[PDB]
Amino acid sequence: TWKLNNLLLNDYWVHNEMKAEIKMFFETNENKDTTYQNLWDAFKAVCRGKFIALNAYKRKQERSKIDTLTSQLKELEKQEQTHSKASRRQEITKIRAELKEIETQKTLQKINESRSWFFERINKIDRPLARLIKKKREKNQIDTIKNDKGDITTDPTEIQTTIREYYKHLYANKLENLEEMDTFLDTYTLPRLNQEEVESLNRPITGSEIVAIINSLPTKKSPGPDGFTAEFYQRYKEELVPFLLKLFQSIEKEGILPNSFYEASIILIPKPGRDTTKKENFRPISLMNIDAKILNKILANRIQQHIKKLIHHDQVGFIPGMQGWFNIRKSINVIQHINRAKDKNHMIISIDAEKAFDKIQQPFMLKTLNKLGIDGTYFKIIRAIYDKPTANIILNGQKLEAFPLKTGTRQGCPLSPLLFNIVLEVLARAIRQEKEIKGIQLGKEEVKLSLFADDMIVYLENPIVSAQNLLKLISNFSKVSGYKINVQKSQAFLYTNNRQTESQIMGELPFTIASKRIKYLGIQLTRDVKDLFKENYKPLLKEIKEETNKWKNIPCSWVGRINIVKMAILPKVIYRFNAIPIKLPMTFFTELEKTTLKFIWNQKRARIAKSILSQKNKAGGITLPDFKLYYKATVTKTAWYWYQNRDIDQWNRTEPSEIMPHIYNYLIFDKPEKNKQWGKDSLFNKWCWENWLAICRKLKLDPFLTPYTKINSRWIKDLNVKPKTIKTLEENLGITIQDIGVGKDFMSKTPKAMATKDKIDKWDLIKLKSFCTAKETTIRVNRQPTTWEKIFATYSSDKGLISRIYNELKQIYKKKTNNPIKKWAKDMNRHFSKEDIYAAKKHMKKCSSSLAIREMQIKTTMRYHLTPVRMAIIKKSGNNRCWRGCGEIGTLLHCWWDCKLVQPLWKSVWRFLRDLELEIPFDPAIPLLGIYPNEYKSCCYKDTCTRMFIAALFTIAKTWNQPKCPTMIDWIKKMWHIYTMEYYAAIKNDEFISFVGTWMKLETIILSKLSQEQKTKHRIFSLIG
DNA sequence: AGTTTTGTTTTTTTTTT
DNA sequence: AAACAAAACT
RNA sequence: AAAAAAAAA
DNA sequence: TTTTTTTTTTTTTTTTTTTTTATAAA
DNA sequence: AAAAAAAAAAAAAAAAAAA
DNA sequence: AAAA
Ligand SMILES: Cc1cn([C@H]2CC[C@@H](COP(=O)(O)OP(=O)(O)OP(=O)(O)O)O2)c(=O)[nH]c1=O
Ligand SMILES: [Mg+2]
Ligand SMILES: [Zn+2]
């Protein structure tokens, strides 16, 4: 079965022929003998045909010379068989060499192109580095399976039969009891879309809407069974979009899809931590055609606009703008309530749906859509999509016969996640409505359910009655929906006053009782909240230690190892902070940094100080992650939710009410409270507040009355003023006191405000007028806001909040450090200005795109290398002499510049610089640091000079302690290696005009100095000429 | 008149289901 | 994390 | 070796 | 209930002690 | 020579006692 | 070498 090889899309001739035939197919064929649904499948056939004809012809053309030479040679050598002739034996000898020459040159180019690709990526957070830490990928196979007979057997046809028959059976059984489905849907109260929303769903698809979905498709994904890639649609979107628009208009009008839209390829994924050999345990992941996914993406985006009307905020999975940590913190707060409660009769139950996406009954799903009020062209298209889907299973690369998908949503489809949620929402609403399933009461809050996708947790009081009624309702839902739970795999915490009472409830109920802990959404919930640190954070330290211990001999530098910590460790650390932001002891951070540094410096003491690595300005953009500042950024982030005061955030309201419940709405940018006994038992919120204050006083802010103080605040309420006035001001004029206006602008800022001014309750203006015009009020409110205050007040999106706060914290806590560039200036007798020190830092960033070349420069400037002077101090000795043996004292400036063994190389480089007909002083700061005197600071030739100098640095460093001269030829080899890596990358990225500028002059000079012997031995030949 | 800063956009990997 | 472009401050 | 949302660099 | 004193914790600064054996390539 | 760690000082918040 |  064919696939498009994306490499063909690059090639100038291939593109021109395809663009020509796409025009020619549609102009010829398009008429009313054909439906557009048929015509689209006919187009794809012709297009797949032409790619095959183009690929084959291209491959012939590339081989034509060796084709000819091999034919011509064998002809002459058969002439040898009758009579053996000297001149022919010469001619045969000549050509047989040239055949071997061409085969060599093709081989080398393939190696150099591969090395060039790796040279761009090395030590970067990219697929190569990610693959280095991971084990070898698998090619999925079956050779042994466990049989319907109960046998473990290995016959190839018997496995193909046993797999297919099993998956065919899973999807086969569609329910038929439509009248019972209606009865369940009438039993309960459900939302409805209104006429404006429904009109939005059914609106005509447009050409601009299609191109936006094409632009966003994920590159480097497998194609569907027809073998066209996302890269194809992106390449030809100019031709394809007019015809695609005609396709979707025809589907809207008729509700008939093309036959290919139904097709999908199942590949079998083994589930984590379970048997391969059981057919029981695989996940079927589907590949669909890209044209069908374009349509399905259109429909999913439309319904996503409305989804918050349909789905209650107890569901956070798949929902835009929601967070999984919302459910984790809510659940921990409920568990604390039970721990505190004097009379215990309570249960917490974790439930998961078995094969949830596969077992949804499609007729129930379509009835649900109508009941919510979705009908018209949108419902018509959804019904067509489910009319007859089929799968083929691809096993060991072989394509099995196809079966119908009569249950389930399509498990690799963009529309399937939302459709599953809408169906599950019918059960969620029914549980909330039913009052003999009793929730837990937390002051003014009742809590019953939290959902994440198909994952469900339930909070009950008086479980003996309440849990039985829950099970009964789920049975009724199962009969109509198809949804099913495994009750034994469902885990519960049970709380009772006596052991007798526990034994009764356990006897009656089907659930598994967890004494210590339940794993949930990535974390451990504990039966007592005291345990949170022990179960979550202590295990996380132990797991990081083992992980770095395995990696300890991995072959990358300290630069690459820093990136490994960022890529692999940092995400799981942040996730745990965000789920459970409890006060952590200082020893936790001490152990985490010791472990991480010991890995980066390969169990040897650091070569560069962690102080210098702290800031991006220093060390060329390599930065070490600060775990304490990430912890502070996560704890402080909660304050953004307190200021927003959103009705969806029930997780924030859930902490112990005991003295006073409202206070968190009043804390931020609002007046200090005398009472200091709120939050006595707070797990999260009290620690958040203490961190917020400490940062504000570090900044020397007054946090308590600000340009962002709300009208809905204690400041206005301690003025004893009627809520009708408060609401009037917000309705008319906006929410901040600065929107009212203070001092001389009290209402006068707009006519709309003075239009408001008369309206308000008579005496309350005199109260307001006094406060708003007071001398202290004008001073505090009129000041300019800081960047810190803008984070919490200004932004309507929680998006990207940890990264903003962390960037502020790094400036607030910015430390002083030693500068290596100053020590260089002392090793030489010279002063570097601020402009010189700026040039050194920029150069260390901009010397290359490759981290390989950048690392070498960074090590040179930052004084990485050991010296005899340093080593004699360490060993407590007086033998500080140059290791090369020239007899002088081994300072760092001796080792790089001044040693007589190194000096002949540097003079060689200055001879080339005269052949480029530059002129530069002979000054160690230019090649080692990148600091030029004030004339040459501008010059265009610096990119050439940078390549010459960094090549010299490599040559000297390679024989650092050796009693021999660095040679000129080793220097030319390095400079030619860099030239080669840059050439293939410059083509791949279409940069060849830049490349020719830098290298062209230098390349001519390198070739002029070598002999033909040397050029042959070291394979030095032009890639430009 | 010149350089630095701030924001958006395109590309990588990891977390949950 | 990088690059590019727009606006303000030195 | 596919889908959705979220997070960081 | 309010104000002042005392005690504890955290963060920053300064001084003292210890190191590593060459490096880049892989 | 250079980096890290330990020790001491300084400041602010919280608690208890007195006015 | 650490991809497709
Ligand atoms: C992990 C994962 C999940 N999904 C979707 C589709 C199903 C739901 C539920 O997945 P679940 O872990 O419950 O598994 P489930 O299918 O419900 O089977 P069991 O719950 O193990 O019976 O999430 C997916 O599309 N891709 C994935 O890689
Ligand atoms: Mg499930
Ligand atoms: Zn020397």
Residue numbers in the entry: 249 to 1273
Paste lines from the article:
Long interspersed element-1 (LINE-1) retrotransposons are the only active autonomous transposable elements in humans. LINE-1 retrotransposition is performed by a ribonucleoprotein (RNP) complex composed of the LINE-1 mRNA bound by two encoded proteins, ORF1p and ORF2p. During TPRT, ORF2p nicks the first ‘bottom’ strand of a 5'-TT|AAAA-3' target DNA sequence, exposing a 3' end that primes reverse transcription of the LINE-1 mRNA.
Our structure reveals the full engagement of ORF2p with the target DNA and the pA30 template RNA. The domains of ORF2p adopt a basket-like shape that accommodates the RNA-DNA duplex in the RT active site, as observed in the previous structures. ORF2p binding creates a sharp bend in the target DNA and roughly breaks it into two parts. We find that the CTD melts and interacts extensively with the target DNA, rather than with the substrate RNA as previously suggested. Our TPRT complex was stalled immediately after initiation and before completion of first-strand synthesis. However, our cryo-EM map showed that the top strand appeared to be nicked. Furthermore, our TPRT structure would represent a mixture of states of the target DNA due to the heterogeneity in the cutting sites, together with the ability of ORF2p to unzip the target DNA.
